[PDB]
Design an enzyme around this catalytic site. Structure first.
Site, PDB file in Angstrom:
ATOM      1  N   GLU A  45      -9.541  -4.972 -18.118  1.00  0.00           N
ATOM      2  CA  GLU A  45      -8.984  -4.907 -16.748  1.00  0.00           C
ATOM      3  C   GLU A  45      -7.490  -4.470 -16.707  1.00  0.00           C
ATOM      4  O   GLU A  45      -7.098  -3.690 -15.875  1.00  0.00           O
ATOM      5  CB  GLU A  45      -9.173  -6.269 -16.060  1.00  0.00           C
ATOM      6  CG  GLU A  45     -10.644  -6.598 -15.768  1.00  0.00           C
ATOM      7  CD  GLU A  45     -11.262  -5.825 -14.555  1.00  0.00           C
ATOM      8  OE1 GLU A  45     -10.540  -5.041 -13.915  1.00  0.00           O
ATOM      9  OE2 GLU A  45     -12.479  -5.957 -14.305  1.00  0.00           O
ATOM     10  N   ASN A  82      -7.307   0.597  -4.852  1.00  0.00           N
ATOM     11  CA  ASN A  82      -8.670   1.075  -4.692  1.00  0.00           C
ATOM     12  C   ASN A  82      -8.773   2.032  -3.537  1.00  0.00           C
ATOM     13  O   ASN A  82      -7.919   2.043  -2.638  1.00  0.00           O
ATOM     14  CB  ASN A  82      -9.644  -0.099  -4.487  1.00  0.00           C
ATOM     15  CG  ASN A  82      -9.462  -1.192  -5.525  1.00  0.00           C
ATOM     16  OD1 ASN A  82      -9.195  -2.371  -5.214  1.00  0.00           O
ATOM     17  ND2 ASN A  82      -9.629  -0.822  -6.746  1.00  0.00           N
ATOM     18  N   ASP A  88     -10.641   1.955  -0.977  1.00  0.00           N
ATOM     19  CA  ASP A  88     -10.704   1.235   0.309  1.00  0.00           C
ATOM     20  C   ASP A  88      -9.371   0.678   0.843  1.00  0.00           C
ATOM     21  O   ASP A  88      -9.354   0.007   1.853  1.00  0.00           O
ATOM     22  CB  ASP A  88     -11.742   0.105   0.224  1.00  0.00           C
ATOM     23  CG  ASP A  88     -11.272  -1.108  -0.584  1.00  0.00           C
ATOM     24  OD1 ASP A  88     -10.257  -1.119  -1.305  1.00  0.00           O
ATOM     25  OD2 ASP A  88     -11.948  -2.111  -0.471  1.00  0.00           O
ATOM     26  N   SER A 117      -7.525  -1.588  -0.656  1.00  0.00           N
ATOM     27  CA  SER A 117      -7.215  -2.837  -1.291  1.00  0.00           C
ATOM     28  C   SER A 117      -6.488  -2.518  -2.638  1.00  0.00           C
ATOM     29  O   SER A 117      -6.466  -1.384  -3.053  1.00  0.00           O
ATOM     30  CB  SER A 117      -8.465  -3.664  -1.503  1.00  0.00           C
ATOM     31  OG  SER A 117      -9.323  -3.067  -2.459  1.00  0.00           O
ATOM     32  N   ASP A 172      -5.754  -4.274  -6.758  1.00  0.00           N
ATOM     33  CA  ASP A 172      -6.104  -5.261  -7.777  1.00  0.00           C
ATOM     34  C   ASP A 172      -4.817  -5.676  -8.501  1.00  0.00           C
ATOM     35  O   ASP A 172      -4.001  -4.803  -8.823  1.00  0.00           O
ATOM     36  CB  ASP A 172      -7.067  -4.661  -8.794  1.00  0.00           C
ATOM     37  CG  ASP A 172      -8.326  -4.074  -8.144  1.00  0.00           C
ATOM     38  OD1 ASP A 172      -9.016  -4.708  -7.319  1.00  0.00           O
ATOM     39  OD2 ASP A 172      -8.573  -2.901  -8.432  1.00  0.00           O
ATOM     40  N   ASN A 214      -8.693  -8.844  -6.586  1.00  0.00           N
ATOM     41  CA  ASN A 214      -8.652  -7.897  -5.496  1.00  0.00           C
ATOM     42  C   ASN A 214      -8.160  -8.542  -4.154  1.00  0.00           C
ATOM     43  O   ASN A 214      -8.592  -9.632  -3.767  1.00  0.00           O
ATOM     44  CB  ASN A 214     -10.038  -7.216  -5.356  1.00  0.00           C
ATOM     45  CG  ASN A 214     -10.052  -6.121  -4.297  1.00  0.00           C
ATOM     46  OD1 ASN A 214     -10.434  -6.364  -3.182  1.00  0.00           O
ATOM     47  ND2 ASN A 214      -9.649  -4.954  -4.640  1.00  0.00           N
TER      48      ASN A 214
END
Ligand SMILES: [Cl-]
Ligand SMILES: [Cl-]
Length: 129
Positions: free
Chosen positions: A35, A46, A48, A50, A52, A59
């Site tokens: 990750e 991301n 969308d 959002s 992380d 998220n």
């Protein structure tokens, strides 16, 4: 902070992650590797809108508030910035809520694609734990 493998393993064990919800410590170390490459300051945006955050790339759509994710739930009840600390307590506490959430560690895309079904024990080999 960029953790070493055995250093993170020991931090995670002390914060209660070893075998949490049946997931051995090697799973968590593997997920953090792929990750964030063990870097508490990792962020990724991301498609969308959002983002992380942190060693476990938690998220902002569901878990934390970053003030810029319209319709964010903030289910861990923390600013996302708290997830980028050298102290992994906030990340670990929120991970425990995510992994209890129904889909287990499959919530972490990197874990599903890179750790799941592999010899995860290798991640804690040689560590003083
Ligand atoms: Cl706990
Ligand atoms: Cl599970």
């Amino acid at each position: 902070k960029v953790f070493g493998r055995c250093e993170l393993a020991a931090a995670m064990k002390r914060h209660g992650l070893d075998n949490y919800r049946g997931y051995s410590l090697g799973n968590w170390v593997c997920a953090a590797k792929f990750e964030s490459n063990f870097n508490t300051q990792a962020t990724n945006r991301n498609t969308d809108g959002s983002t992380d955050y942190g060693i476990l790339q938690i998220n902002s759509r569901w878990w934390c508030n970053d003030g810029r994710t319209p319709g964010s739930r903030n289910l861990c009840n923390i600013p996302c910035s708290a997830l980028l600390s050298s102290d992994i307590t906030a990340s670990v506490n929120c991970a425990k809520k995510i992994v209890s959430d129904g889909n287990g560690m499959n919530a972490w895309v990197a874990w599903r694609n890179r750790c799941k079904g592999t010899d995860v024990q290798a991640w804690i080999r040689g560590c003083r734990l």
